[model samples]
Target chain A: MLLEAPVYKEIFGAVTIHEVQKVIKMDTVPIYTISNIPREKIYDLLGKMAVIVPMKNEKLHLVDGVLKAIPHKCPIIIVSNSKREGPNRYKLEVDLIRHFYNLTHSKIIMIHQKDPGLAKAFKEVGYTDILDENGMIRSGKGEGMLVGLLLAKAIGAEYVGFVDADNYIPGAVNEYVKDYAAGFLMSESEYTMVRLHWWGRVSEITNHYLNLLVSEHTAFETTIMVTGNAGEHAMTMKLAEILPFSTGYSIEPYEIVYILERFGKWENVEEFKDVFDQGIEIFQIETLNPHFHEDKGKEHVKEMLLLSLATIYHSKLATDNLRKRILKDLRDHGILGENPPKPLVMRPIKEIPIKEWMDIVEGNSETLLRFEL
Target chain B: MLLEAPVYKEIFGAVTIHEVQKVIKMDTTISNIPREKIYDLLGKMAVIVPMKNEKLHLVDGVLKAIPHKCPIIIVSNSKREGPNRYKLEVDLIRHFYNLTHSKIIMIHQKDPGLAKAFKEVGYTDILDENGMIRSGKGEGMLVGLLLAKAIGAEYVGFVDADNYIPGAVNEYVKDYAAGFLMSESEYTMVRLHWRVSEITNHYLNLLVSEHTAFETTIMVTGNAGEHAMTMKLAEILPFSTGYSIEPYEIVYILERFGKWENVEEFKDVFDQGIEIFQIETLNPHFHEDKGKEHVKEMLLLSLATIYHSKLATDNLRKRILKDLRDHGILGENEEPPKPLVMRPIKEIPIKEWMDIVEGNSETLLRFEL
Candidate 1:
């Protein structure tokens, strides 16, 4: 693995607006200018990296566009929870994946979120809780990634990254994966995480309010790193397995929450001692491309805000002030009424042993085909 | 004057977010744009400081920051009944102007003659129910602009007294001159994105600005308080009240100048003729967050102004309203802040304002070059 100092880095601890201004003036973090890195190095990092694309009911062309952006040498695991019966979107996706794979001869693995084999494989490996009563993996974006992580491990990848299927700008998708590699190339630690903050999104959501929300709730005022809900994130395999994954919309932010809870601060890493032994270095890189994604409407935004806040509220590291602020903000947003909502509980994928999960998946006949790629 | 294409620019009217992103990625600095060869236009501009209860030292620093070429106007709205800080501030400013030999004008927003001038001109809307000049930065700025026009200044710019950095304040005026120098149109304005020390909040500013821009297709960066305009544009465009006055300036400009059609008397105010140059300043911006309420209030007023403006679309209106709603700025029990509407200056005759200015006002200080 190539090692270098991260072009940019920040350990967000007790960061006040004053400190934020100081960092801005410092200008130590070099711009992640595309001109600085060579394509061959990006490809080299891609050789070791595996990307996960989790999708549901997305148009086939958009899915193809995302896949095309990844390097041919990189392994792509597409976990689709698309409707199986309605319009046969899954079949169409599989057909497209198959066609694209044959053209590039690249490694691309496809799986359905509701596959019985996946649940059976996890259940045999002591991850029965992730399965529903019907013996299929639960439906959620995080669930799809959890399954992809298992597959990523099966493929023997050193690092794993995630890309959302809803991105309209293909160039941005390309840069995100390259940025993950550039971040990884700079990493000296075995346990590293890289997150992409879009230069700007054409959305109404501002990090200013998020920081204000955080500053109001926490002991100090700090700028919330722009990409708190980064759907695009990457991690070393050593870090990925050890990190606890939260379910549903809280998955992405919870990863950071889980990381902070374990290694960064808030203590109590006794059960997480195995992964804690490995050093964790987070590289939060601000990307140049402006993110233009589909707007899921106001209801989706409200749900996203609630889910994100709930993840923070329920975290062990959350201060009392933070929790109260979240509640007040919830009520203020009219998301909650006189009665407060329950805290969202998070689950880690490691409830199942890695060794047993790998062995059980090998026994499945259809899953064995991914090994060829 | 320069013949080069404007080095920094954006189309606020009917612009898509996609189009804005392209400009953000394009050359963002003015270094490439040829500098204005002449300082003559800079001489025509005046800097107006509209303030209320700012620290004395802060006002001194602001006054010191004004370049020698530009004249200064101070429109004070400090509490008139209290510790006589208002009286002292005006006294101190008058002395400083006399010592510096600078062409400066100072007027109280509540000045009886100024209120009388507005009353005679059918522009008494800015006056309070008590017939006092309304206590608002926008109203003060209006008085400052009227005074600037009365003195034969061709254009007027604004600088806030609260600024800690004198260098940055001067840079804003030069940027304004640069914008006018590059403009082919008669009406031109310049806005500077705070040369931020950190790129994090800079990114966040873009997030909200772009969202606002996407709706109005006109993006003004965080409603820059430091801006300048030709007297011609200033007279025709409506002004928003108070802290919102800054952002509302951009909103009003976009409203009247964004569209093509104009009446016979003022045919020049059209989309094709107006230019807004957004510059990335070399000097860093430093404004300490004084009161959380002020920050929150300013953001609310700014968004409210944008939401209520004629330029706002149904799509953008709902998004901003929903944003405020989600933030609890507006609860079910509470309605959004009444958006401050624009009072078109042209509605008030210049002839009437000049009559009162010549009658009731005297130049406090003047420096002969």
Candidate 2:
């Protein structure tokens, strides 16, 4: 897997109103036009891709949007962390996936994120660390996402992408998968990752007012990158095995920081030794639509800001200025103290080779689904 | 006017994943809301186009986007002296109006006739030292608004002249009509949400709503440039001088309408309710980014207007200034009070301004209505 320098490309520019009008008069329109992946190349990539949709208490309409947007040929793995008790949201999700699988005639796998049988399978494979106090897989978004990745790898998927089941627009989900394929098609490296920098974020007035203050000043702008905590991202199967995942809202961002530290260069991690020998690529893209999700107020913004920044601040590759800036920001926003706190770096769930875990899960996990792919 | 603490109700909430999906099962398509009332609104509406240095072709696109029934009044602050100026714009607009037979009019802020009209009406508050209207988009809009009122239109809406997608301009107007359709009062205002498309995960919004006594989604369109208002409401509302114009509307409306008994007339005007509608537009807003300096000036003025208003608390004011300093919008040691001026149009009656506008003002170019 040893390869050349990893590729890192940022695809976006600030569009002026003048440029938009210029296109109207001319024969050519400058629409950053689709992701660079060509039409013929799309079918080839879809054959190798598996999309993982992780859901919690999300409703059926949003789930349908995600499923409908995914390419029909790609395998689908849904890991649900919805309610197991009360109204039983898990049952609803199972029925939804079953209907979708039957309708599209596509490969679909469904599982509960906290299935005890799945936990026992991991334990049998000597990868039992993910279990919480109740011996169910820990209740976190990252846990569900990790299980989907392992499931995809087990089914011989070459690449895997995760789309949150909270999307309002199905077209955006479609675009994200295409962006993932585009990044892979353009990659020259043996390992790769694709992250969508969603275009617009319409928040409550206070949220915009607060973000305006920091973004106006910081030349260190991925602050408004909106997708730093992107629930929409994808990776090559080989790349996914070595990278770490953090819990909660911090999960998505930690994926980037972990990759940058462990495989950003060919001489990085001591723990993920193989990652240090191979090239790893990262592609960040700006999607077309302005994101209009649920409006979590001032405090939600506060938590995401703190946790996401902590992940970056704790990264081994974090620049000294970035660390200092994050600390100051936390203190100013009243999320941190004047005295510097030790970065909370949760150790990565490590050394679990995907195949060995898959072998045990295929044999022992009763709750796991074996679809006719 | 004596007043009670305002009932500044924030009304909006997370359109939960549960809610969105349920809509899918119930109905998949959000068909266009009926446009019968929208077409009716076009007759009573007067759309204003405010521009500085914009692409002439794009300006033409915007002019064409407005419905045929409503008249357009272009207020330009561009140079009348140079080649890259308002001359071509005025020419293009006239030509477009002649070809389409649309009711379009053009006005230059620096015109001598406009200066005399202001002087005669004694509404020289927006006038510069040379007695011409000040060079800014806010001033441009004020003139257009006054002109809209003069022409006997009940409603006034503004379209930013640099729109890339004309379809968005049309959607904004339709949303305004929807807002008015849903309003309960005679005095109304509508603001547009600029960009709305993708959905992201915010699990904590549900928790935030539970904790923060704020039941409404954080609905802040403080600096919304695209907005509409009833002429009666516009008459009494105070206008900010420059870039703070849009956000200033938030505070000014709060000061007047937020307080229940500010004036005897206020009760009669808002007898039903003071309806404020903030709706989302379907098209993504594409506008000319004037540059970093342009954005910096705009944001500074916008925030400062809010920070200095009577509605702003001492605590909120401090936090705002602190944020400005932290973001470096305000310098480390350079502190200054808010610089925006609010001159209510009520102070100078539209009756008096209109009396002088006909022959005294050097600005009158009319197309067929």
Candidate 3:
């Protein structure tokens, strides 16, 4: 221990302990204890909370969100990929793009994809857009996110939240922060990760339903959930740092899986807030409740499914030792599983109606950057 | 109106005074309370009660946390998050999360986000990638999940959770399916939303930060908090349609923010496993402690700060809004002042972590949504 100098007097100052099996006698390593997870003299504490959204190409969704539905703006980081010289292009989703702009605040920043030079560096370094500038892709999503979070940290954002570019119903995204705060209040802001999951989506159960079934199977292996029938949600700051992001399939699990593998510690605010972790699930049917939404056309669905499976297969395969990898490679990919896109990068706002987009009606964004490249 | 119903019998199934008032009294027509604000019936409700600081803070902290974590278990996925060896910690935290827990299980999920990240609910609906090929809801994902946690690997479990999560917060559905008896204890099995950070993009911050003490909270999350606190305890399951995510979060604030005092009887967990509140979660869902709502309730906090800590009851002291409003301190179109205002009103740096403690509201009750 480095000269037992306590950090943050009353604040992060927690007590340390040592456990020794009782032989009725055994020498134990020196252990120490302080007491509490520092409580800032309420007077000195930061009381307000706002998510700093590092904006990017999702302007397709950002424009609409900036206006009608804005998360309370304590601070905002508009880290747009458009600055990279790539258009915050809504290539096929033109109409959606037009609608997005109508709903944003006049003050929001629209960074070029290369504005921060991060995306450019990512591209030069062989990084692809994680989620398409429009929506869907996990390659560069981590990079985009890294830039955004960095900015949040720099700008002094207590809680920096990131929403996707494409969405249909953002209500859940909007609601997630509310839930986060609720958890915060009850636990009085302890270190905890609050996972947001919604009820399933109820579509007309279309004819190509077989495809939906195939895709759900693919998702089962990757995400903890495919809620809101999409990927859009929130967690806390402590976890943000603890869980770093990898390129694609790795990002989501990187955070959670890392905590697990690394055996990182965290607080459970949900418990304090009357969380009935009853060994039972409430919502039945299927699908996660909408946080940020967009109905994926069959093509989109096809591509999404294939991608998730591909990502999982490829990512998992990459990590295996050469011998195991070669053995696994012998098996047909199809036999192992079909294709499916990871839910983490499926942009949900692209499919929303223009009216809703203009209303910025749901889950809502800005910029964050780190000092390092 | 639509049909007579109990307030929370089912997710958004019943009616609340708020919905009734809005629809009935104001002529404002809301069909029903949004279903996203409810909870599912988990056969067992296991509260995570960890130990925390409270030598002096214990007296009151212990009392307040009791009602919630009574007999709660102290769930530590690891012997410690890392180098965690606080002797009285297990006990102190139970008092912190919610005082008064009779049973405190210090078992480790083995990793930080291991158990929670997996989200194990017994029975659930799933939308697997295979569903794209199979058709209707495909096969349920719960089975795969159970097997994975029991015998299979992580991928197997991940697949189940991925497929089962539905899209809307309708019909308020959240279920803690079953309890699997482990080597020495029974872990409460619950299927809840294991959401992520930035997955929603920045939309979360935009919609929630302003108006409230969001800046302060954001600052903290960026600096130290786990970022945003996910609603593990506040999940509103879907019974199969409308939105039910809001209630899980809202109810918690009303119930625990100030009431934790009712649970404050701290007992050392290891020594006797005896505690006023049995803390369940020993791991830090870990992150910063941002106080976003405090800003929203800044006015309320400002007034209450004078009354300060210890007092959970509604402030008898006058507030900025009621005080200013009562004295007719209105300009013109400027709306009324917000309710709560505590200390730390001034300098809100960027990316700080914090949480709002107490704010009693008349409207807080009823909707129970």
Worst 10 residues of 2 chain B by lDDT: B14-23
Instruction: Write down the RMSD of all candidates, one decimal each.
Output: 17.0, 16.9, 26.6
Q: Order of candidates by DockQ, top first?
A: 3, 2, 1
Summarize candidate 3's per-residue lDDT along B147-172 as a digit string, tens digits.
22222121110111111112111101
TM-score of each: 0.46, 0.47, 0.30
lDDT of 1 by residue, B293-355 (tens): 676676777777766765556665666667667865777545467655547676566766767
The better-scoring model by TM-score among 2 and 3 is 2
Worst lDDT window (10 residues) for model 2 chain A? A14-23
lDDT of 2 by residue, B1-369 (tens): 001111233422211111110111110122232434566777798988888878986787676556666778888878666574877786887666444456777777777777777887677778888776777778888888888887888889988988765545755665566666655567778877641111001111222233455543443465677889888778767777777787767556555554456456666654555567666443456787678777767766766776666655555556656766776579776654566464666666666676666666565677653
Residue A20's lDDT in candidate 3: 10
Specify the highest-lDDT model's number: 1
Model 3 reaches what TM-score against the true structure?
0.30
User: Per-prediction TM-score of chain B?
Assistant: 0.81, 0.83, 0.22
Q: Which pairs, if any, clash in model 1?
A: A24-B197, A24-B198, A25-B197, B12-B217, B12-B218
